[PDB]
């Protein structure tokens, strides 16, 4: 199977700028049998380019494709707001038909450090047998942000999950929620709960903690 590799994983630009996305193949793609699609949250992929460089009907010429053999490119010459999405390349030169992993074209705005909140598991959930400690980071930019959980200053690892929102349509920021999950047992065996957040809009990592029972 032909592996399509796309880079960069994310492209952070502003409307007006030119975007150039690469899609390298691990063997060459015959007759330049390569397509590009756009995909927005929850939608099916939408065809933009076929046969490496031909635009699908209705696709505006800000979009152009090129390349050959093992190397292909998609160029968006001056991004409009609706151009920020994910894009995939797809080869149909040999079987099996394969897709690249995509590249997200994201809106670049000024740095915005997050507002941070921590929340103790409710007394009611505690009775059910688990404690869900939650930390929110709101309205920050860029998307990279490290959320770290500390319990009695023991750096906590492998018992949390995060979930991040889409870029806000109006202000281009993100919010992210992290959840530290312990049995009621362990939760009981400790006292200081802490959420350490590092983000580039922050001069020093922020920390929101609380003492068990004190909230």
């Amino acid at each position: 199977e032909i592996v399509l590799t796309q880079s960069p994983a994310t492209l952070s630009l502003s409307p007006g700028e030119r975007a150039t996305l690469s899609c390298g193949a691990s063997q060459s793609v015959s007759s330049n049998y390569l397509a590009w699609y756009q995909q927005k949250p929850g939608q099916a992929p939408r065809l933009l380019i076929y046969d490496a460089s031909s635009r699908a009907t209705g696709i505006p010429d800000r979009f152009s494709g090129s390349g050959s053999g093992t190397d292909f490119t998609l160029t968006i010459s001056r991004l409009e707001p609706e151009d920020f999405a994910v894009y995939y390349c797809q080869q149909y030169g040999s079987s099996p038909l394969t897709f690249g992993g995509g590249t997200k074209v994201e809106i670049k705005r000024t740095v915005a450090a997050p507002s941070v909140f921590i929340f103790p598991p409710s007394d009611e959930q505690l009775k059910s047998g688990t404690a869900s400690v939650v930390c929110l980071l709101n309205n920050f930019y860029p998307r990279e942000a490290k959320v770290q959980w500390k319990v009695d200053n023991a750096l906590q690892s492998g018992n949390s999950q995060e979930s991040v929102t889409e870029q806000d349509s109006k202000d281009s920021t993100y919010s992210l929620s992290s959840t530290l999950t312990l049995s009621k047992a362990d939760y009981e065996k400790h006292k200081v709960y802490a959420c350490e957040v590092t983000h580039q809009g922050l001069s020093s990592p922020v920390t929101k903690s609380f003492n068990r029972g004190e909230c």
Binding site: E1, Y33, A35, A44, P45, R46, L47, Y50, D51, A56, Y88, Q90, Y92, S95, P96, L97, T98, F99, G100, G101, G102, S115, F117, I118, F119, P120, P121, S122, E124, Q125, S128, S132, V134, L136, N138, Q161, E162, S163, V164, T165, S175, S177, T179, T181, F210, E214, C215
Partner: protein
């Protein structure tokens, strides 16, 4: 110019078999190779196989052992069967069609997609818990847990029953084969009188609500 409408069971347990169907409305149903393609939540697309009206199939060897795609020219539909499912097969499955019957296999027509989730759990409505905090705007949250499938929607109302518009929306996270999701409204600090707000969620298995105590 052409519509493909899909349907099929969206939730299964490990070892069962996934069964989806796609119906075509418009154009001719002949000669095109009709494809099934899938996409794991958060990942890229994988092509599964294709079939033309004569029954000729082409399969991705990544699934050949377990896949069977078939056609029904009397209803202008085609279908996919994937046996011995595991959590890895949780994904949005799409049917698709190429523009020309004798051209490249790239696709300009697509079905809407069917999320199919494979979990060991049983369908359940979510159980809800309040998130009370501890910047001239205070955060109030609601946590939804132990729900399946992943089909939830939140909403917020004031004690006064007027809507809270200030909603923030997070993607579910998977654990123990079931899902959890949180939601928050940002209420301006200096709104200290209501003692709480109300969180609401809708889910196929039943809608729930829970008052979330205003802090300070």
């Amino acid at each position: 110019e052409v519509q493909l409408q899909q349907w099929g069971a969206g939730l299964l347990k490990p070892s069962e078999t996934l069964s989806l169907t796609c119906a075509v409305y418009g154009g001719s149903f002949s000669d095109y190779y009709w494809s099934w393609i899938r996409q794991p939540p958060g990942k890229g697309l994988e092509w599964i196989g294709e079939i033309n009206h004569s029954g000729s199939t082409n399969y991705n060897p990544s699934l050949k052992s377990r896949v069977t795609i078939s056609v029904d020219t009397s209803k202008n539909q085609f279908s996919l069967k994937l046996s011995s499912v595991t959590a890895a097969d949780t994904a949005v499955y799409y049917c698709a069609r190429p523009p020309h019957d004798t051209s490249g296999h790239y696709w300009n027509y697509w079905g809407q997609g069917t999320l199919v989730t494979v979990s060991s759990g049983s369908a359940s409505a979510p159980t809800l818990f309040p998130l009370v905090s501890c910047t001239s705007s205070v955060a109030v949250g609601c946590l939804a847990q132990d729900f399946l499938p992943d089909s939830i929607t939140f909403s917020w109302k004031y004690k006064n029953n007027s809507d809270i518009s200030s909603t923030r929306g997070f993607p579910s996270v998977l654990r123990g084969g079931k899902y959890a999701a949180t939601s928050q409204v940002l209420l301006p600090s200096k709104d200290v009188t209501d003692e709480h707000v109300v969180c609401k969620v809708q889910h196929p298995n039943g809608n729930k609500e829970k008052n979330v105590p205003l802090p300070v």
